[PDB]
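Following up on my earlier message about zinc ion. Here are the inputs again, as you asked, copied directly from the submission form:
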Amino acid sequence: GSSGSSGVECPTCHKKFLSKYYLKVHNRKHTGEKPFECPKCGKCYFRKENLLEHEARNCMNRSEQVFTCSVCQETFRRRMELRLHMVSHTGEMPYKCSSCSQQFMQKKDLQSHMIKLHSGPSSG
Ligand SMILES: [Zn+2]
Ligand SMILES: [Zn+2]
Ligand SMILES: [Zn+2]
Ligand SMILES: [Zn+2]
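Thanks, got it. Here's what our run produced:
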């Protein structure tokens, strides 16, 4: 049935990809001991409660690579989206700017933003 094409393969789930890059980032999950994991698909869930929900909320199903929240188990076809969504759970992003008052998830992400956008090689 389902077929793929020239590319790498996951020595864990046996899932081929277009480029190693994706394969690696994908394996990120596999690695790292976990307490529980959906016995239907294989989604590790630190908290049991979360695991149970998911099973009902959503499970393995031929569909575009999406992301699942960690509080409401939402659905995001993109990674960044989830990041901009999590803020709703914690009010707002963990990091913020001062000149523009931007928002970021990482400290370095902000510092660099102020060192390039605010402190770029241009005078604009
Ligand atoms: Zn895999
Ligand atoms: Zn599942
Ligand atoms: Zn959420
Ligand atoms: Zn800024």
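One observation from looking it over: The helical segments are 20-30, 48-57, 79-89, 107-116. Hope that helps, and feel free to reply on this thread.
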